[PDB]
Amino acid sequence: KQTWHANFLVIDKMGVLITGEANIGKSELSLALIDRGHQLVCDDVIDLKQENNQLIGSCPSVANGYILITGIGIIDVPKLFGLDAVVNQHEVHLSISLVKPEKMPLLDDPLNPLYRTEIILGINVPKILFPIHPGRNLPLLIETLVRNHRLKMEGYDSSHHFHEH
Amino acid sequence: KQTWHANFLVIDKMGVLITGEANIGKSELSLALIDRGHQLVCDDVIDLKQENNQLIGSCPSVANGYILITGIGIIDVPKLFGLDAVVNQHEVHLSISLVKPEKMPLLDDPLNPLYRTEIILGINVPKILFPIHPGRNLPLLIETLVRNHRLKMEGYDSSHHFHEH
Amino acid sequence: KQTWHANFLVIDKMGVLITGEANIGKSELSLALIDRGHQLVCDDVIDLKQENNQLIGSCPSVANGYILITGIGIIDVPKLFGLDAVVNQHEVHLSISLVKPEKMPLLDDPLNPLYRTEIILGINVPKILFPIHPGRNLPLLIETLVRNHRLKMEGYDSSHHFHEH
């Protein structure tokens, strides 16, 4: 069965995978997102599976509910942020890849995010390359990026349903 | 008629103009300030005019309500933060100029901000030079700077009115 | 009588001393912590004394209630954040020393903070060396570090009381 190296959070109903280089503040981003009222599925590694044409991501036991942040150590998220701050599984909707500005590819349309696609167990998951600047309120930026994505996906779902004619 | 290159926000009843070099997180600052409960007038460019001894700043249509943040793209602020998160016009009270610490002039009195004056269509608008350090919670700092300014202006208005003797 | 160079805040019932090199955002950290609902005892310097087997820290008058942040100047914290945002004294429970990542010593157990002890007027105060990265939401990190510490101290107090057998 299938593992995947990333953090997995529920943000605005969207299961969001977060990826990037080591020691850029990913785990710190998870914490900040939890503090804004979002939810943790898993830190570091995720179990993946297909059930009913859904890519579901789940955290293995033992590690469930815990986050590591250097300086702090282990964080029992449920103890500190409530039982509703953690979820045992959720569908994967989006994959965000945090990239250093210098390594960021050229932008075709700067009025939109840099969208790509990730193949996760043969399923197309939308993927955004997001430039990471230190101290521009990254949690708010990622939350805003995800909410925009959900509106955009609902935009396509409306358009498809609009073809009832 | 008169344009002006800056961001224009309403903060604690004060119309505040934000200026600075390119790619330092100005638009990201606007978003963060909106998230703290403040209001957007306009991103990038502002229409200015004089009405009843007031310098009023207004956003041109089409662009009204939208913010661009690299990585995210366009942000329909009303859709995401509510109708009350945007305002069509407001009086200009303060101009903050975000400066890199290295380029910051010498400080005469470090117990107060570095105050200057901007001539905007012949009107004296108070101007603060604010040093920008990455990740010291700039939104909170700018909010605090503006609230202090309003108290200070109310201090002079009290003093002037105190000369009833 | 005894002074001590540090910032002193009440965080989650814990009197916390904050220390570090000059111009790293300590005073900015105090402000941010106040904004999260915590309390100021004193900026810069603290009066210390022993009363009833407690190390109590108190702010000298005149300076009481005020914070200096370069760019802003003086901040009357009570005026801006309420009377309950400042406290005249509190017991010292923890000492956090903000360290630059490069100067940070080797980590024995990365699942826990780097704990040391400070002798303050002959009393053992637990001391954490915390690595400071710009823009990972340091206020949230320090708040989380302190809440974890309180749980940990309550853990030892439970264990000691558990030796009733």
mmCIF file with all atom_site columns, all heavy atoms in Angstrom, chain A residues 9-27:
data_model
loop_
_atom_site.group_PDB
_atom_site.id
_atom_site.type_symbol
_atom_site.label_atom_id
_atom_site.label_alt_id
_atom_site.label_comp_id
_atom_site.label_asym_id
_atom_site.label_entity_id
_atom_site.label_seq_id
_atom_site.pdbx_PDB_ins_code
_atom_site.Cartn_x
_atom_site.Cartn_y
_atom_site.Cartn_z
_atom_site.occupancy
_atom_site.B_iso_or_equiv
_atom_site.pdbx_formal_charge
_atom_site.auth_seq_id
_atom_site.auth_comp_id
_atom_site.auth_asym_id
_atom_site.auth_atom_id
_atom_site.pdbx_PDB_model_num
ATOM 1   N N   . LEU A 1 9  ? -3.649  18.618 5.199  1.00 0.00 ? 9  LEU A N   1
ATOM 2   C CA  . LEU A 1 9  ? -4.542  19.434 6.013  1.00 0.00 ? 9  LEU A CA  1
ATOM 3   C C   . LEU A 1 9  ? -5.892  19.554 5.317  1.00 0.00 ? 9  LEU A C   1
ATOM 4   O O   . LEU A 1 9  ? -5.972  19.472 4.089  1.00 0.00 ? 9  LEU A O   1
ATOM 5   C CB  . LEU A 1 9  ? -3.943  20.828 6.203  1.00 0.00 ? 9  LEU A CB  1
ATOM 6   C CG  . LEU A 1 9  ? -2.521  20.892 6.773  1.00 0.00 ? 9  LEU A CG  1
ATOM 7   C CD1 . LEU A 1 9  ? -1.760  22.060 6.204  1.00 0.00 ? 9  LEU A CD1 1
ATOM 8   C CD2 . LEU A 1 9  ? -2.559  20.962 8.291  1.00 0.00 ? 9  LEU A CD2 1
ATOM 9   N N   . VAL A 1 10 ? -6.951  19.740 6.101  1.00 0.00 ? 10 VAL A N   1
ATOM 10  C CA  . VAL A 1 10 ? -8.241  20.112 5.546  1.00 0.00 ? 10 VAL A CA  1
ATOM 11  C C   . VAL A 1 10 ? -8.373  21.625 5.688  1.00 0.00 ? 10 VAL A C   1
ATOM 12  O O   . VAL A 1 10 ? -8.303  22.153 6.802  1.00 0.00 ? 10 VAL A O   1
ATOM 13  C CB  . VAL A 1 10 ? -9.404  19.396 6.249  1.00 0.00 ? 10 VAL A CB  1
ATOM 14  C CG1 . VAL A 1 10 ? -10.735 19.815 5.632  1.00 0.00 ? 10 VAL A CG1 1
ATOM 15  C CG2 . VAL A 1 10 ? -9.227  17.886 6.157  1.00 0.00 ? 10 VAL A CG2 1
ATOM 16  N N   . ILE A 1 11 ? -8.527  22.310 4.552  1.00 0.00 ? 11 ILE A N   1
ATOM 17  C CA  . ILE A 1 11 ? -8.644  23.760 4.501  1.00 0.00 ? 11 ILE A CA  1
ATOM 18  C C   . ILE A 1 11 ? -9.838  24.146 3.646  1.00 0.00 ? 11 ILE A C   1
ATOM 19  O O   . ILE A 1 11 ? -9.861  23.868 2.450  1.00 0.00 ? 11 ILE A O   1
ATOM 20  C CB  . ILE A 1 11 ? -7.407  24.409 3.871  1.00 0.00 ? 11 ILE A CB  1
ATOM 21  C CG1 . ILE A 1 11 ? -6.128  23.962 4.586  1.00 0.00 ? 11 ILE A CG1 1
ATOM 22  C CG2 . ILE A 1 11 ? -7.539  25.922 3.909  1.00 0.00 ? 11 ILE A CG2 1
ATOM 23  C CD1 . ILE A 1 11 ? -4.840  24.455 3.916  1.00 0.00 ? 11 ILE A CD1 1
ATOM 24  N N   . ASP A 1 12 ? -10.823 24.793 4.265  1.00 0.00 ? 12 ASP A N   1
ATOM 25  C CA  . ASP A 1 12 ? -12.045 25.222 3.585  1.00 0.00 ? 12 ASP A CA  1
ATOM 26  C C   . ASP A 1 12 ? -12.692 24.054 2.841  1.00 0.00 ? 12 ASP A C   1
ATOM 27  O O   . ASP A 1 12 ? -13.049 24.177 1.676  1.00 0.00 ? 12 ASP A O   1
ATOM 28  C CB  . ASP A 1 12 ? -11.732 26.384 2.628  1.00 0.00 ? 12 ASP A CB  1
ATOM 29  C CG  . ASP A 1 12 ? -12.985 27.066 2.091  1.00 0.00 ? 12 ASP A CG  1
ATOM 30  O OD1 . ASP A 1 12 ? -14.035 27.027 2.769  1.00 0.00 ? 12 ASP A OD1 1
ATOM 31  O OD2 . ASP A 1 12 ? -12.917 27.640 0.985  1.00 0.00 ? 12 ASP A OD2 1
ATOM 32  N N   . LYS A 1 13 ? -12.822 22.921 3.528  1.00 0.00 ? 13 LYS A N   1
ATOM 33  C CA  . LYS A 1 13 ? -13.391 21.680 2.965  1.00 0.00 ? 13 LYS A CA  1
ATOM 34  C C   . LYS A 1 13 ? -12.471 20.937 1.977  1.00 0.00 ? 13 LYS A C   1
ATOM 35  O O   . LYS A 1 13 ? -12.808 19.836 1.546  1.00 0.00 ? 13 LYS A O   1
ATOM 36  C CB  . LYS A 1 13 ? -14.754 21.926 2.295  1.00 0.00 ? 13 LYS A CB  1
ATOM 37  C CG  . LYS A 1 13 ? -15.797 22.652 3.145  1.00 0.00 ? 13 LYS A CG  1
ATOM 38  C CD  . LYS A 1 13 ? -16.682 21.696 3.947  1.00 0.00 ? 13 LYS A CD  1
ATOM 39  C CE  . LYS A 1 13 ? -18.164 22.119 3.932  1.00 0.00 ? 13 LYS A CE  1
ATOM 40  N NZ  . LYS A 1 13 ? -18.373 23.581 4.150  1.00 0.00 ? 13 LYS A NZ  1
ATOM 41  N N   . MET A 1 14 ? -11.327 21.526 1.630  1.00 0.00 ? 14 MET A N   1
ATOM 42  C CA  . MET A 1 14 ? -10.394 20.940 0.670  1.00 0.00 ? 14 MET A CA  1
ATOM 43  C C   . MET A 1 14 ? -9.245  20.216 1.373  1.00 0.00 ? 14 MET A C   1
ATOM 44  O O   . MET A 1 14 ? -8.501  20.818 2.144  1.00 0.00 ? 14 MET A O   1
ATOM 45  C CB  . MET A 1 14 ? -9.772  22.030 -0.208 1.00 0.00 ? 14 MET A CB  1
ATOM 46  C CG  . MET A 1 14 ? -10.739 23.000 -0.862 1.00 0.00 ? 14 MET A CG  1
ATOM 47  S SD  . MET A 1 14 ? -11.381 22.355 -2.566 1.00 0.00 ? 14 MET A SD  1
ATOM 48  C CE  . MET A 1 14 ? -12.844 21.238 -1.925 1.00 0.00 ? 14 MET A CE  1
ATOM 49  N N   . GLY A 1 15 ? -9.089  18.929 1.094  1.00 0.00 ? 15 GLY A N   1
ATOM 50  C CA  . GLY A 1 15 ? -7.887  18.199 1.481  1.00 0.00 ? 15 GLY A CA  1
ATOM 51  C C   . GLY A 1 15 ? -6.699  18.690 0.677  1.00 0.00 ? 15 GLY A C   1
ATOM 52  O O   . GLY A 1 15 ? -6.652  18.512 -0.536 1.00 0.00 ? 15 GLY A O   1
ATOM 53  N N   . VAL A 1 16 ? -5.743  19.307 1.367  1.00 0.00 ? 16 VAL A N   1
ATOM 54  C CA  . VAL A 1 16 ? -4.616  19.983 0.737  1.00 0.00 ? 16 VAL A CA  1
ATOM 55  C C   . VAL A 1 16 ? -3.298  19.340 1.157  1.00 0.00 ? 16 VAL A C   1
ATOM 56  O O   . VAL A 1 16 ? -3.009  19.237 2.346  1.00 0.00 ? 16 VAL A O   1
ATOM 57  C CB  . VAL A 1 16 ? -4.586  21.470 1.133  1.00 0.00 ? 16 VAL A CB  1
ATOM 58  C CG1 . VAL A 1 16 ? -3.391  22.178 0.496  1.00 0.00 ? 16 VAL A CG1 1
ATOM 59  C CG2 . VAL A 1 16 ? -5.908  22.149 0.751  1.00 0.00 ? 16 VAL A CG2 1
ATOM 60  N N   . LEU A 1 17 ? -2.517  18.905 0.167  1.00 0.00 ? 17 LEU A N   1
ATOM 61  C CA  . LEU A 1 17 ? -1.183  18.347 0.387  1.00 0.00 ? 17 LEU A CA  1
ATOM 62  C C   . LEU A 1 17 ? -0.138  19.458 0.283  1.00 0.00 ? 17 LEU A C   1
ATOM 63  O O   . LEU A 1 17 ? -0.119  20.181 -0.704 1.00 0.00 ? 17 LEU A O   1
ATOM 64  C CB  . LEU A 1 17 ? -0.877  17.285 -0.673 1.00 0.00 ? 17 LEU A CB  1
ATOM 65  C CG  . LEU A 1 17 ? -1.786  16.056 -0.756 1.00 0.00 ? 17 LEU A CG  1
ATOM 66  C CD1 . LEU A 1 17 ? -1.476  15.246 -2.000 1.00 0.00 ? 17 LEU A CD1 1
ATOM 67  C CD2 . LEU A 1 17 ? -1.630  15.198 0.479  1.00 0.00 ? 17 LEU A CD2 1
ATOM 68  N N   . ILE A 1 18 ? 0.727   19.590 1.287  1.00 0.00 ? 18 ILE A N   1
ATOM 69  C CA  . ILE A 1 18 ? 1.800   20.599 1.264  1.00 0.00 ? 18 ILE A CA  1
ATOM 70  C C   . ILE A 1 18 ? 3.182   19.953 1.157  1.00 0.00 ? 18 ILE A C   1
ATOM 71  O O   . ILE A 1 18 ? 3.528   19.072 1.940  1.00 0.00 ? 18 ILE A O   1
ATOM 72  C CB  . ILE A 1 18 ? 1.807   21.477 2.514  1.00 0.00 ? 18 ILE A CB  1
ATOM 73  C CG1 . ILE A 1 18 ? 0.428   22.094 2.768  1.00 0.00 ? 18 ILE A CG1 1
ATOM 74  C CG2 . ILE A 1 18 ? 2.830   22.577 2.353  1.00 0.00 ? 18 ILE A CG2 1
ATOM 75  C CD1 . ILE A 1 18 ? 0.166   23.323 1.960  1.00 0.00 ? 18 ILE A CD1 1
ATOM 76  N N   . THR A 1 19 ? 3.967   20.441 0.199  1.00 0.00 ? 19 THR A N   1
ATOM 77  C CA  . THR A 1 19 ? 5.269   19.883 -0.150 1.00 0.00 ? 19 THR A CA  1
ATOM 78  C C   . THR A 1 19 ? 6.304   21.003 -0.264 1.00 0.00 ? 19 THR A C   1
ATOM 79  O O   . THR A 1 19 ? 5.948   22.170 -0.418 1.00 0.00 ? 19 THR A O   1
ATOM 80  C CB  . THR A 1 19 ? 5.156   19.093 -1.486 1.00 0.00 ? 19 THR A CB  1
ATOM 81  O OG1 . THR A 1 19 ? 5.142   17.687 -1.208 1.00 0.00 ? 19 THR A OG1 1
ATOM 82  C CG2 . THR A 1 19 ? 6.305   19.398 -2.438 1.00 0.00 ? 19 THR A CG2 1
ATOM 83  N N   . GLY A 1 20 ? 7.582   20.647 -0.177 1.00 0.00 ? 20 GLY A N   1
ATOM 84  C CA  . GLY A 1 20 ? 8.662   21.619 -0.334 1.00 0.00 ? 20 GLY A CA  1
ATOM 85  C C   . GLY A 1 20 ? 9.988   21.110 0.192  1.00 0.00 ? 20 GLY A C   1
ATOM 86  O O   . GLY A 1 20 ? 10.062  20.020 0.764  1.00 0.00 ? 20 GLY A O   1
ATOM 87  N N   . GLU A 1 21 ? 11.037  21.908 0.009  1.00 0.00 ? 21 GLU A N   1
ATOM 88  C CA  . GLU A 1 21 ? 12.367  21.570 0.520  1.00 0.00 ? 21 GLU A CA  1
ATOM 89  C C   . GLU A 1 21 ? 12.357  21.479 2.035  1.00 0.00 ? 21 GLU A C   1
ATOM 90  O O   . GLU A 1 21 ? 11.403  21.914 2.691  1.00 0.00 ? 21 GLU A O   1
ATOM 91  C CB  . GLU A 1 21 ? 13.401  22.615 0.096  1.00 0.00 ? 21 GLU A CB  1
ATOM 92  C CG  . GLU A 1 21 ? 13.677  22.656 -1.393 1.00 0.00 ? 21 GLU A CG  1
ATOM 93  C CD  . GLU A 1 21 ? 14.715  23.700 -1.768 1.00 0.00 ? 21 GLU A CD  1
ATOM 94  O OE1 . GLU A 1 21 ? 15.693  23.872 -1.007 1.00 0.00 ? 21 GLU A OE1 1
ATOM 95  O OE2 . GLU A 1 21 ? 14.557  24.345 -2.830 1.00 0.00 ? 21 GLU A OE2 1
ATOM 96  N N   . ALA A 1 22 ? 13.428  20.915 2.588  1.00 0.00 ? 22 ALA A N   1
ATOM 97  C CA  . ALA A 1 22 ? 13.559  20.777 4.036  1.00 0.00 ? 22 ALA A CA  1
ATOM 98  C C   . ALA A 1 22 ? 13.835  22.132 4.690  1.00 0.00 ? 22 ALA A C   1
ATOM 99  O O   . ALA A 1 22 ? 14.492  22.997 4.105  1.00 0.00 ? 22 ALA A O   1
ATOM 100 C CB  . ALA A 1 22 ? 14.659  19.790 4.380  1.00 0.00 ? 22 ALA A CB  1
ATOM 101 N N   . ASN A 1 23 ? 13.301  22.303 5.898  1.00 0.00 ? 23 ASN A N   1
ATOM 102 C CA  . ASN A 1 23 ? 13.595  23.457 6.752  1.00 0.00 ? 23 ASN A CA  1
ATOM 103 C C   . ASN A 1 23 ? 13.231  24.802 6.109  1.00 0.00 ? 23 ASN A C   1
ATOM 104 O O   . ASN A 1 23 ? 14.056  25.709 6.011  1.00 0.00 ? 23 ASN A O   1
ATOM 105 C CB  . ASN A 1 23 ? 15.069  23.422 7.196  1.00 0.00 ? 23 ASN A CB  1
ATOM 106 C CG  . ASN A 1 23 ? 15.341  24.288 8.432  1.00 0.00 ? 23 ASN A CG  1
ATOM 107 O OD1 . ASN A 1 23 ? 14.419  24.838 9.050  1.00 0.00 ? 23 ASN A OD1 1
ATOM 108 N ND2 . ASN A 1 23 ? 16.619  24.407 8.798  1.00 0.00 ? 23 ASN A ND2 1
ATOM 109 N N   . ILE A 1 24 ? 11.980  24.905 5.674  1.00 0.00 ? 24 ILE A N   1
ATOM 110 C CA  . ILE A 1 24 ? 11.424  26.157 5.159  1.00 0.00 ? 24 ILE A CA  1
ATOM 111 C C   . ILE A 1 24 ? 10.198  26.629 5.950  1.00 0.00 ? 24 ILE A C   1
ATOM 112 O O   . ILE A 1 24 ? 9.665   27.694 5.668  1.00 0.00 ? 24 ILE A O   1
ATOM 113 C CB  . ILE A 1 24 ? 11.048  26.038 3.661  1.00 0.00 ? 24 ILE A CB  1
ATOM 114 C CG1 . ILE A 1 24 ? 9.918   25.020 3.447  1.00 0.00 ? 24 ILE A CG1 1
ATOM 115 C CG2 . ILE A 1 24 ? 12.273  25.663 2.839  1.00 0.00 ? 24 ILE A CG2 1
ATOM 116 C CD1 . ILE A 1 24 ? 9.551   24.803 1.998  1.00 0.00 ? 24 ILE A CD1 1
ATOM 117 N N   . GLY A 1 25 ? 9.752   25.844 6.932  1.00 0.00 ? 25 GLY A N   1
ATOM 118 C CA  . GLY A 1 25 ? 8.617   26.216 7.776  1.00 0.00 ? 25 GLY A CA  1
ATOM 119 C C   . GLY A 1 25 ? 7.294   25.550 7.427  1.00 0.00 ? 25 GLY A C   1
ATOM 120 O O   . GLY A 1 25 ? 6.233   26.126 7.675  1.00 0.00 ? 25 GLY A O   1
ATOM 121 N N   . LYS A 1 26 ? 7.352   24.345 6.855  1.00 0.00 ? 26 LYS A N   1
ATOM 122 C CA  . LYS A 1 26 ? 6.151   23.577 6.514  1.00 0.00 ? 26 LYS A CA  1
ATOM 123 C C   . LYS A 1 26 ? 5.349   23.204 7.752  1.00 0.00 ? 26 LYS A C   1
ATOM 124 O O   . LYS A 1 26 ? 4.148   23.448 7.815  1.00 0.00 ? 26 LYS A O   1
ATOM 125 C CB  . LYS A 1 26 ? 6.517   22.291 5.778  1.00 0.00 ? 26 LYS A CB  1
ATOM 126 C CG  . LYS A 1 26 ? 7.100   22.482 4.389  1.00 0.00 ? 26 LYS A CG  1
ATOM 127 C CD  . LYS A 1 26 ? 7.506   21.140 3.767  1.00 0.00 ? 26 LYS A CD  1
ATOM 128 C CE  . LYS A 1 26 ? 8.765   20.585 4.419  1.00 0.00 ? 26 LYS A CE  1
ATOM 129 N NZ  . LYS A 1 26 ? 9.210   19.292 3.833  1.00 0.00 ? 26 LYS A NZ  1
ATOM 130 N N   . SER A 1 27 ? 6.009   22.591 8.727  1.00 0.00 ? 27 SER A N   1
ATOM 131 C CA  . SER A 1 27 ? 5.345   22.204 9.979  1.00 0.00 ? 27 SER A CA  1
ATOM 132 C C   . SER A 1 27 ? 4.840   23.428 10.745 1.00 0.00 ? 27 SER A C   1
ATOM 133 O O   . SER A 1 27 ? 3.800   23.378 11.399 1.00 0.00 ? 27 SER A O   1
ATOM 134 C CB  . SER A 1 27 ? 6.289   21.387 10.864 1.00 0.00 ? 27 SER A CB  1
ATOM 135 O OG  . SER A 1 27 ? 6.476   20.079 10.341 1.00 0.00 ? 27 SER A OG  1
#
